[PDB]
Amino acid sequence: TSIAIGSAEGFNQADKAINTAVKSGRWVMLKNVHLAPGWLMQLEKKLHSLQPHACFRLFLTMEINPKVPVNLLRAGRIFVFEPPPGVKANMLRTFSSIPVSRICKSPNERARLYFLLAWFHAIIQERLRYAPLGWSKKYEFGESD
Amino acid sequence: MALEEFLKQIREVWNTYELDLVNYQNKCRLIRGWDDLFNKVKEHINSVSAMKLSPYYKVFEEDALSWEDKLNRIMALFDVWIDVQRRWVYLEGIFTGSADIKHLLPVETQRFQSISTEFLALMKKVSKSPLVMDVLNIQGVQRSLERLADLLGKIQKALGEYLERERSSFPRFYFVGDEDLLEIIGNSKNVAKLQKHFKKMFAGVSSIILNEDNSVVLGISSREGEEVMFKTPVSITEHPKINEWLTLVEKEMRVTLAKLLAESVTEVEIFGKATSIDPNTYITWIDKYQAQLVVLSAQIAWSENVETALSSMGGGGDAAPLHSVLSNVEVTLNVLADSVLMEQPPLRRRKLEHLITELVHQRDVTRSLIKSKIDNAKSFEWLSQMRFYFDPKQTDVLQQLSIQMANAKFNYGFEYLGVQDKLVQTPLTDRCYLTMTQALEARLGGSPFGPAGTGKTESVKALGHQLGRFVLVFNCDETFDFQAMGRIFVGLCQVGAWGCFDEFNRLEERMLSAVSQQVQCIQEALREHSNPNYDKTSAPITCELLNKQVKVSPDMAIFITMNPGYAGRSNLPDNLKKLFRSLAMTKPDRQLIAQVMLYSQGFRTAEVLANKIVPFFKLCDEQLSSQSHYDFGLRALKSVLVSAGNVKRERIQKIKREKEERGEAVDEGEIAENLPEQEILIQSVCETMVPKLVAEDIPLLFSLLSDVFPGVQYHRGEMTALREELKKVCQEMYLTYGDGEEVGGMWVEKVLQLYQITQINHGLMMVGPSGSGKSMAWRVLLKALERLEGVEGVAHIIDPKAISKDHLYGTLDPNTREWTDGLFTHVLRKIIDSVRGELQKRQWIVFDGDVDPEWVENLNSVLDDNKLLTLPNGERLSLPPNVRIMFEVQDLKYATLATVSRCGMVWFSEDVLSTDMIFNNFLARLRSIPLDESPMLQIQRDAATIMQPYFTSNGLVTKALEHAFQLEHIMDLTRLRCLGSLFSMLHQACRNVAQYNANHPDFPMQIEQLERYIQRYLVYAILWSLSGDSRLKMRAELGEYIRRITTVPLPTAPNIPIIDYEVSISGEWSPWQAKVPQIEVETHKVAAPDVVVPTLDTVRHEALLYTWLAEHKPLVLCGPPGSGKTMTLFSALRALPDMEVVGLNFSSATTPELLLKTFDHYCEYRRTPNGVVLAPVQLGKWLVLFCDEINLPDMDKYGTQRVISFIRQMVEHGGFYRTSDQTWVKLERIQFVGACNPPTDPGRKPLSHRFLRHVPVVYVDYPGPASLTQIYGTFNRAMLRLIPSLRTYAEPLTAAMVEFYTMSQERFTQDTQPHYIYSPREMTRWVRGIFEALRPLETLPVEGLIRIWAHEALRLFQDRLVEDEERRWTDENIDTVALKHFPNIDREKAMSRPILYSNWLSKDYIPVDQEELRDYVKARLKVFYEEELDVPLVLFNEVLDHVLRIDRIFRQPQGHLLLIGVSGAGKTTLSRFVAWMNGLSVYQIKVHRKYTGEDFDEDLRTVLRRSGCKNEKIAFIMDESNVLDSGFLERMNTLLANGEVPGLFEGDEYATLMTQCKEGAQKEGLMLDSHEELYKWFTSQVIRNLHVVFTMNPSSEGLKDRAATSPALFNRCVLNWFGDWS
Amino acid sequence: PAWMRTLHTTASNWLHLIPQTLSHLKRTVENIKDPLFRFFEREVKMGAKLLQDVRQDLADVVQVCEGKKKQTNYLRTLINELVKGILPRSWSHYTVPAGMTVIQWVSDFSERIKQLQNISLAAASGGA
Ligand SMILES: Nc1ncnc2c1ncn2[C@@H]1O[C@H](COP(=O)(O)OP(=O)(O)OP(=O)(O)O)[C@@H](O)[C@H]1O
Ligand SMILES: Nc1ncnc2c1ncn2[C@@H]1O[C@H](COP(=O)(O)OP(=O)(O)O)[C@@H](O)[C@H]1O
Ligand SMILES: Nc1ncnc2c1ncn2[C@@H]1O[C@H](COP(=O)(O)OP(=O)(O)O)[C@@H](O)[C@H]1O
Ligand SMILES: Nc1ncnc2c1ncn2[C@@H]1O[C@H](COP(=O)(O)OP(=O)(O)O)[C@@H](O)[C@H]1O
Ligand SMILES: [Mg+2]
Ligand SMILES: [Mg+2]
């Protein structure tokens, strides 16, 4: 169950989804939780006094923001998502994200096109590291592109 | 006897005029002829009012006044009757035609039945006696309608959930407001009333065509008159209910257009791939079909020709028939170009313009295809083009047309678009089409982004109109929340309409994240349509919106347009951004847009004109100076280009009009040959660009014009007709009119320029410094147009920043989701509804106030070509053509390009309004308007002749004004603040002469004495009006400058400034010192709050305050805290009876609502025939609002103080808007006085120049050393009469007081600590403190006097000090000063360092030994432990001093304490212990995690009742931690200063308070029954009994910030720095 | 205070580096028709106003740091920026690279005024 956080109804839905999930092993993902720093503190206290199902997982999506409470950060395990360190890492991430059956369809030339796209996507993204020379501006070339 | 005839005519009209009755469905007899009734009543009301001016009105005064009452009563009744009858009609239809509502809402249905019974009963009475007078005499008919209106409104607001149910049955109702929907549902039989609502539910359907019966819908029509006739008409009889035949109309609109398209495609194919086109046949085909289908047919034919040509080129080397496709386009475009070179019908001409724009693009695409040697239909350069495939063999007519771009395929929606202006199809627009259609195929949203004026919104609509979709534009703001967006999505999804959300990043970031969930679920539903496995004969696709299953039409789409460069905007979360495909639209192709538009309008030299106009705009943006009101973007270019076509059409009409009276040589083809096309373009540029230019840019732009358009001259039309009316209106308004270089000529040009902008723009700004003539320019123009054109002009003036943005536009209820209109929304909706003929009048909505992006960007869709006010409830209000949106502002330093580019600009400079013009206006009014309410006018006229020489250009006043601007003033100096002050003072001088004539009925003042008085008073008035806000040195310097240049006789003293002289009524200079006697003050009034010792400054300031106050002119006293501003104002008010002062204490958090509570308590709102009037409750009294800190209220990030804008509105407009009912309220007998510290002081903001022009400022400085000696030497002489043996020491005691006070004021300043302010207030407390310690004493040695003097100095100067060094300095210099002025005294007995005074060991306040005091406090602490608080305390020396300091404050009236120190130092415990020793009850608010503002208000009521009604002495001890909200201190700031909170007791609380006050005052023996008298006694009890102790920790940032939030904490509370334990 | 003495030297030094004179271009009937004059007139007009404002603000800061005029709200805001080394927002009138500090702006502003003086000197002595 995926929930955006900003709405007042989102807070009510998040609590019900979490309460249902902790008794069934269901997964809950809450996105943009950095937009509600005050509610995040109350969620950390709620999670502390809880013994959910062994399969239950709670995912919190946020930007890297100083508003995120320290107490929540200590209670959870942090994973940083950022541009891949280089061309090799960028292209390996691309080939893992795209299912194999996607590339391996009937036209055999489809595989080389995806490689060219992966190389092109890596070169364009890596040039952003050179803020001014690679591109005049810091464009958000990303996964959607 | 002409007056008698008018009365006879009025009597005869109303003895026969009957309410015109019509049967309504055999139920009652409604009333028509509202226009006839209202105009007839207004006509007699004006005639009765006008005949009062006639001198013969006295004989018929009573009869005319009787008719004024009757006519006013007729207006008040039928203005309510019309709204009651209107509401009953559609409510009766709903509660009769839908039996389901009776079960759904039984309570409302029965309640409506009861009201519907009383309405029908009153209808039957009207039927018996339809005569208006008989209806007017029906008992309680006025109150019956008032109850009917209120009751019917409650039923209306109770049908909201029923309306939400009907919106599902016809989803286009989701875009209609609740009231309009009730009109639609309830009037389902009266179809003629449905016509005004179709523009809200349809893209281009403005009305429907009906048969004579109104039972069959024959077709639909657009706002321009274009009609679509249905192939199969829709019968309303066979489908009676509103939502089914409306659905059938929507379907027949789509089916008819598709059938009409097939017929059009058949004919247009003949024109395609044809060598020659006959214009008559082609024009016939254009006229036969609708504008949207004509362009659609042309696109279909061109696409199939290219497909045919590319198919033949399959071999590659085969000959190219693409040239024939180009050839056909060339031939067709030549016929279109020839057609627009001559006169055409307006609908056909626009159709021809659309075809030219379409074919120019087809010509460009075909040329690109030929140049690129494309020979295959599957080539991407052809697939990337937008193509149109038509299959006549397709069975479903709605799917015969397929629009394909790249891989994206679309069906045509066949929404009737009417005649929508098309965009020039530029390469940027081509790229926009490709990107957005890729997003549509991917079931993603489109996100065009870029700076303002790049075509983002128009391109989205153009693409939607290309696909035949209903495109809805929403001007988003922060009020578009999750619930509002979802409901809009529900309407969009079911209708199948496109949502273009502009300024989408103006939503809050939390709302953007929440909305992303709704956008995603719709997009998943959209992909279910695209699934080939899904079959149309199955369950409809549905997504979950707002916890409901909502059907999704495949045609709906979501688009967001944003300016990512605007600072302060919300950043979109990434999960939302992945749902949209973004395209940068940054550089519009201006030269192509200009070339195609000029070519489509018929300009033969369009290529030459486009190559000049587009670079010219580029040059203007760089060659001209930089101004915030300058725009040379695409909107400005588009405005000129559109105006160019309008100017070309009028010249052609003018040329042939000359030909009608000169021969019969109409040769239209040759008429276009000799047509100055360049001169036409220059006229459009000058009519649109010139009014925005500053003076030094005007020659620059004409040099640029000569550079790009050589030999082309601009000549304005000499508008004699308008200028004659303007000249007459100026005469009636005492204004100066000029022509050319005459006086007032520049201003008249700006009025004419403003008129030109009103004819080209529906939104315009008048920008210029305060006092530039902007207001008079549009007020005079509005009246002149009424006389010239016969159309009544109505102006609604709004101060947008004087109210909250919620009160300007409205609010959506968080829970009930009910919409309440704001001020602007209510005004615009009233004009659209046109209940009282507002659509036939010129309606100007003037936003007079500051412009900031927060509120004006809600008008982006209003000010652009959309002309729509979009509300978060989904409602869209169209701007009627008779409405102009105007913005009168002094600057645009916070407006963004988005706003500036969307509005016509007229720039006013301060040179436009010359000082000679202002002088003429003052003299003209002085010679015509009597000041008394003629012997008074005769005095003014003679005085005007005397003043006239000095008010000429380069006269005394002009030279004085120029010199004054060179001086330094406590506030910023503006021309109108000086002249406004100067004219008020001169009016008082005229009143002085009249008052003298009253004193001398025998010998009135002669001209020689009148001349002798006026000249000196004018000099006197000039000095105070131009330097009264400056220091003495600046006041002096203006004196010598006047002395050099004036010829008025002046005082001949060698070194006495002129400002030191008044003007006696005998026309002689008299020194102000003659009115400053050395008084002896009664010994019991020593340093009392009401006692003022006359000084040179006090008598001058009081006289100046008297003049401004007597004229009801708002004024501000400015000076350092404690300089005597309140003292001087209240002293002047004592000499001015019939004026009640009410003190308001502004803080940083003060809003207009503080003023409104004061109005609620002291004033009443009364309904008058001319509107609501707010007047003081007490009759015959002028109520003075005294604001003590008028420049503390918080300035927002856009430089605006809301309360200041509110006060400016009440002064300049004489009123304000009541936000509850959106009604203008007029003030009567209410004036304003301000007090403040200099704006350079911390926490103080400069006052707006638009507020200062009305408010003269007097500077009250601290009294000098000699003035202080005179003031407190008088007090010391009186107080030392208690002990006759101490009379000799009066002078040294005063000298020591002044010396130490001056030294302390220099030593400690606000730079070190924010509370280091020393003023004569300390001197007043110093004398009072000594006096209180001397009253019960029969005798005292001089050493005893010094000890009291030293003790009070420590309490007043040392107790606030923070540092030990500062306290050491104060302790040392007290000894130094005392021995300097008191030699031969025993130092030890008088200055022993432990100086302690107490009344605990005796009856009197006498010195106490430290050890004796320690034993007493231990003895009392023992009792305190057993009775109040068993917390043992260790007694050290500082505690003994502290408890004595707290004891002093609890024994003073309004004794408030500010205890500052570290937590746990005993501040609260000592306060409770001293409170228990003085008999004071301790009150502490019992805060908790859920303690809120209304909990604090109830707690405040409890304490005030006990101390105000029960005479209970209370120590209200409250800590800084108790302040859980800033609103807590706004209440305490008022309570500390005034002992009252104006809005704390309301409703039943006030009624209970009055009962308790009456009981409380009875126990005191006072005879009080009046509520006002009871409230004053209650305030006086709170003043003497309530003691507030404020405890806070030392925080440097917190303490400085604390002063602005609660200035009363630092000037009404005694501060004791307990600090930390030493 | 230590800041009061250090800021006094800096402001006095800046008044030495920054030039003091900038004469507006004399508008003439045939100078208005010259495009170069039209652009160059704008440069001095906006340049002269900025030059006077900065010099006046710096002179007030020096006088404040000598204890001769009382600190106003504007001076308190300006003095706080100068202590922190942030370029005052009032001084910012021509576009500059982001992250430019006040010490570089004063040197940059001084060079721009010198060029503005030479342009006006040529127009005054020699014509447009
Ligand atoms: N044409 C005129 N001839 C004579 N007096 C004029 C004329 N126009 C304005 N005035 C007077 O000069 C002053 C100008 O006030 P006006 O309201 O026109 O200025 P404004 O620029 O709209 O003001 P603000 O900036 O405060 O909104 C008023 O005292 C007005 O009576
Ligand atoms: N391709 C075009 N052809 C004609 N007029 C255009 C074109 N693009 C933009 N305009 C005009 O430019 C102005 C600004 O367009 P608009 O869509 O409001 O811009 P934005 O949404 O970027 O602020 C309008 O007058 C609009 O009609
Ligand atoms: N001529 C005077 N006669 C009596 N008191 C004076 C005189 N001049 C100054 N004062 C004292 O100066 C103080 C001014 O208080 P107030 O009028 O409230 O000041 P402000 O309005 O400037 O804050 C009072 O203590 C008042 O008694
Ligand atoms: N003079 C004192 N001797 C002993 N204990 C004290 C003394 N002053 C304060 N305390 C202790 O500190 C506590 C807090 O006192 P309180 O008046 O609430 O402090 P404050 O108002 O400075 O925060 C008291 O309850 C007491 O235990
Ligand atoms: Mg837009
Ligand atoms: Mg005005």
- What DSSP string runs through B1585-1607? HEEEEEEE---HHHHHHHHHH-T
DSSP annotation of B313: G
Token pair recorded at residue B202: 């349809």
Q: Given its phi and psi angles, is residue A25 left (phi above 0), alpha (psi -120 to 50 degrees) or beta?
A: left
Cα B41 to Cα B69: distance, rounded to the nearest angstrom:
12
Question: What φ, ψ does residue B500 adopt, rounded to 5°?
Answer: -100, 100
Token pair recorded at residue B859: 């008008």
Residues of A with Cβ-Cβ distance to B573 under 8 angstroms:
31-32, 35, 63
Burial class (CB in 10 A: 0-12, 13-18, 19+), B1567: exposed
User: Cα dihedral sign for B959, B964, B967, B972?
Assistant: negative
Task: Decide if A3 touches B, using CB distance below 8 A.
Answer: yes
Query: Which atom from ligand 3 is nearest to the alpha carbon of B1127?
Result: 17
Write out residues with Cβ below 6 Å of ligand 4: B 1431, 1433-1434, 1439, 1461, 1463-1469, 1591
Token pair recorded at residue B1286: 């101490």
Ligand 4 center–CA B320 separation, angstroms: 102
Ligand 6 center–CA B377 separation, angstroms: 65
Q: How does DSSP assign B1388-1410, residue by residue?
A: HHHH-SS--EESSSSSS-EE--H
Query: By the 8 A CB rule, do B823 and B808 touch?
Result: yes
Q: Residue B517 and residue A4: Cβ atoms within 8 Å?
A: yes
3-state helix, strand, coil in chain C (%, to 5): 65, 0, 35
Q: Residue B482 and residue A32: Cβ atoms within 8 Å?
A: no
CA nearest neighbour of C55 among C98, C5, C106: C106
User: Cα dihedral sign for A129, A139, B894, B749?
Assistant: positive
Query: By the 8 A CB rule, do B523 and B444 touch?
Result: yes
Cα B751 to Cα B777: distance, rounded to the nearest angstrom:
5
Cα B1056 to Cα B330: distance, rounded to the nearest angstrom:
92
For B427-536, where are the E strands, in sequence order?
A: 445-449, 471-475, 498-502
Q: Give binding residues of B as ranges.
A: 450-457, 768-775, 1119-1126, 1461-1468
Task: Collapse the DSSP code of B1309 into the 3-class scheme (helix H, G, I; strand E, B; otherwise coil) and give the result.
Answer: coil
CA nearest neighbour of B951 among B976, B974, B989, B983: B983
Residue A97 CB coordination number (10 Å):
10
Cα B646 to Cα B684: distance, rounded to the nearest angstrom:
9
Token pair recorded at residue B1490: 């859920």
Cα B1124 to Cα B1232: distance, rounded to the nearest angstrom:
18
CA nearest neighbour of B872 among B177, B1550, B1571: B177
Q: Residue B703 and residue C45: Cβ atoms within 8 Å?
A: no
Task: Collapse the DSSP code of B1223 into the 3-class scheme (helix H, G, I; strand E, B; otherwise coil) and give the result.
Answer: strand
β B1257-1259/B1215-1218 pair status: unpaired
Q: Is B977 in the pocket of ligand 1 (CB under 6 A)?
A: no
- Tell me how many degrees the CA angle B1304-B1310-B1314 measures, rounded to the nearest 5: 115
Q: From the CA of B446, how many Å to the nearest CA of chain A?
A: 14
Q: Which of B510, B515, B583, B812 to mutate to probe the A interface, most A CBs <10 Å?
A: B510
Nearest-Å Rg of the Cα atoms of chain A is: 20
Query: By the 8 A CB rule, do B466 and B414 touch?
Result: no
Paired with B876 in beta bridges are: B870
Q: Residue C39 and residue B699: Cβ atoms within 8 Å?
A: no
- The beta-carbon contacts of B1524-1530 under 8 Å, at least 24 apart in sequence, are B1524/B1487, B1524/B1491, B1524/B1492, B1524/B1496, B1525/B1492, B1525/B1493, B1525/B1496, B1526/B1149, B1526/B1605, B1527/B1149, B1527/B1493, B1527/B1496, B1528/B1493, B1528/B1496, B1529/B1147, B1529/B1149, B1529/B1605, B1529/B1606, B1530/B1147, B1530/B1149, B1530/B1150, B1530/B1154
Task: Collapse the DSSP code of B1335 into the 3-class scheme (helix H, G, I; strand E, B; otherwise coil) and give the result.
Answer: coil
Token pair recorded at residue B921: 């206006």
Q: Which residues of C, range 38-57, sit inside 8 Å of B by Cβ?
A: 38-39, 42, 45-46
Query: Could you give the C-alpha distances from B1359 to B1366, B1442, B1616, in angstroms and in order?
Result: 10, 10, 5
Query: By the 8 A CB rule, do B517 and B523 touch?
Result: no
* Residues 6 or more apart in contact with residue B864 via CB below 8 angstroms: B457, B635, B902
Residue C128 CB coordination number (10 Å):
19
Task: Collapse the DSSP code of B55 into the 3-class scheme (helix H, G, I; strand E, B; otherwise coil) and give the result.
Answer: helix
Length of chain B: 1622
For every residue of B575-636, which 3-state class applies, written as one string?
HHHCCEEEEECCCCCHHHHHHHHHHHHCCCCHHHHHHHHHHHHHHHHHHCCCCCCCCCCHHH
Q: Which residue's entry shows tokens 């209000």?
A: B877
Q: Do chains B and C touch (3 or more CB pairs under 8 A)?
A: yes
Cα B1462 to Cα B1520: distance, rounded to the nearest angstrom:
12
Q: Is B1119 in the pocket of ligand 3 (CB under 6 A)?
A: yes
Q: Which residue's entry shows tokens 């929507």?
A: B250
Task: Collapse the DSSP code of B417 into the 3-class scheme (helix H, G, I; strand E, B; otherwise coil) and give the result.
Answer: coil
Q: Is B1607 in the pocket of ligand 3 (CB under 6 A)?
A: no
CB-nearest to A7 from B514, B577, B578 is B514
Query: By the 8 A CB rule, do B862 and B763 touch?
Result: yes
Cα B1038 to Cα B1043: distance, rounded to the nearest angstrom:
9
Cα B1615 to Cα B1358: distance, rounded to the nearest angstrom:
10
Cα B1360 to Cα B1461: distance, rounded to the nearest angstrom:
11
CA nearest neighbour of B1374 among B1305, B1445, B1303, B1326: B1303
Question: Residue B1286 is which amino acid?
Answer: L
Cα B581 to Cα B595: distance, rounded to the nearest angstrom:
31
Token pair recorded at residue A37: 């720093």
DSSP annotation of B1354: I
Question: What φ, ψ does residue B1568 adopt, rounded to 5°?
Answer: -130, 130
Cα B179 to Cα B1102: distance, rounded to the nearest angstrom:
57
Q: Is B979 in the pocket of ligand 1 (CB under 6 A)?
A: no
Token pair recorded at residue B1576: 């004053």
Query: By the 8 A CB rule, do B223 and B199 touch?
Result: yes
Task: Collapse the DSSP code of A64 into the 3-class scheme (helix H, G, I; strand E, B; otherwise coil) and give the result.
Answer: coil
Q: From the CA of A13, how many Å to the nearest CA of chain B?
A: 11
Query: By the 8 A CB rule, do B1067 and B1016 touch?
Result: yes
Query: Could you give the C-alpha distances from B1135 to B1072, B1073, B1110, B1129, B1255, in angstroms and in order?
Result: 18, 19, 10, 10, 21
Q: From the CA of B1189, how many Å to the nearest CA of chain A?
A: 36
Cα B1553 to Cα B452: distance, rounded to the nearest angstrom:
58
Query: Could you give the C-alpha distances from B1608 to B1090, B1146, B1454, B1500, in angstroms and in order?
Result: 20, 9, 12, 17
Q: Residue C39 and residue B623: Cβ atoms within 8 Å?
A: yes
| Residue nearest ligand 3's atom 16 by CA | B1124
Q: Is B590 in the pocket of ligand 2 (CB under 6 A)?
A: no
**What distance, in Å, lies between the first and last C-alpha atoms of chain C?**
51
Query: Could you give the C-alpha distances from B129 to B20, B137, B696, B1372, in angstroms and in order?
Result: 11, 11, 71, 96
**What distance, in Å, lies between the first and last C-alpha atoms of chain B?**
96
Cα B1394 to Cα B915: distance, rounded to the nearest angstrom:
67
| Residue nearest ligand 1's atom 17 by CA | B775
Cα B405 to Cα B384: distance, rounded to the nearest angstrom:
6
* Residues 6 or more apart in contact with residue B676 via CB below 8 angstroms: B712
Ligand 1 center–CA B332 separation, angstroms: 57
Query: By the 8 A CB rule, do B519 and B509 touch?
Result: no
3-state helix, strand, coil in chain B (%, to 5): 55, 15, 35
| Orientation of helix B677-689 relative to helix B698-708, angle to 10° | 160
Q: Give binding residues of B for ATP as ranges.
A: 450-457, 768-775, 1119-1126, 1461-1468
Cα B1483 to Cα B1470: distance, rounded to the nearest angstrom:
14
The ligand whose atoms approach the alpha carbon of B774 most closely is: 1
Chains that touch C (3 or more CB pairs under 8 A): B
Q: Identify the experimental approach.
A: cryo-EM
Query: Helix H segments across chain A?
Result: 8-21, 37-48, 70-75, 87-97, 100-103, 110-127, 131-134
Nearest-Å Rg of the Cα atoms of chain C is: 17
DSSP annotation of B1319: -
Task: Collapse the DSSP code of C54 into the 3-class scheme (helix H, G, I; strand E, B; otherwise coil) and give the result.
Answer: helix
Q: Residue B575 and residue A4: Cβ atoms within 8 Å?
A: yes
CA nearest neighbour of A3 among A28, A39, A34: A28
DSSP annotation of B176: S
Chains that touch A (3 or more CB pairs under 8 A): B
CA nearest neighbour of C7 among C57, C72, C45: C57
Cα B152 to Cα B156: distance, rounded to the nearest angstrom:
6
User: Cα dihedral sign for B1450, B1451, B1453, B1459?
Assistant: negative
CA nearest neighbour of B86 among B21, B41, B30, B131: B30
Question: What φ, ψ does residue B798 adopt, rounded to 5°?
Answer: -125, 135
Ligand 4 center–CA B1408 separation, angstroms: 25
Token pair recorded at residue B1155: 């003023």
**What distance, in Å, lies between the first and last C-alpha atoms of chain A?**
26
Q: Is B1507 in the pocket of ligand 1 (CB under 6 A)?
A: no
CA nearest neighbour of C79 among C11, C19, C14, C20: C11
Alpha carbon B965 to its chain centroid, in Å, reads 31
Query: By the 8 A CB rule, do B1147 and B1604 touch?
Result: yes
Query: By the 8 A CB rule, do B581 and B445 touch?
Result: yes
Cα B1487 to Cα C41: distance, rounded to the nearest angstrom:
66
Q: Do chains C and A touch (3 or more CB pairs under 8 A)?
A: no
* Residues 6 or more apart in contact with residue B499 via CB below 8 angstroms: B472, B474, B488, B489, B492, B556, B557, B558, B559
3-state helix, strand, coil in chain A (%, to 5): 50, 10, 40
Residue B1349, CA atoms < 13 Å, CB-side half-sphere: 33
Sheet bearing B763-767, strands edge to edge: B793-798, B842-848, B883-889, B763-767, B904-907
Q: Given its phi and psi angles, is residue C7 left (phi above 0), alpha (psi -120 to 50 degrees) or beta?
A: alpha
The ligand whose atoms approach the alpha carbon of B769 most closely is: 1
Q: C-alpha dihedral over B1598, B1600, B1606, B1612, to 10 degrees? A: 120
Residue B441 CB coordination number (10 Å):
15
Query: Which atom from ligand 3 is nearest to the alpha carbon of B1324?
Result: 25
Task: Decide if A101 touches B, using CB distance below 8 A.
Answer: no
* Residues 6 or more apart in contact with residue B388 via CB below 8 angstroms: B296, B299, B300, B302, B303, B304, B401, B402, B403, B404
Question: What φ, ψ does residue B608 adopt, rounded to 5°?
Answer: -65, -45
Q: Which helix (H) or strand (E) holds B752?
A: helix B745-758
Question: Residue B720 is which amino acid?
Answer: T
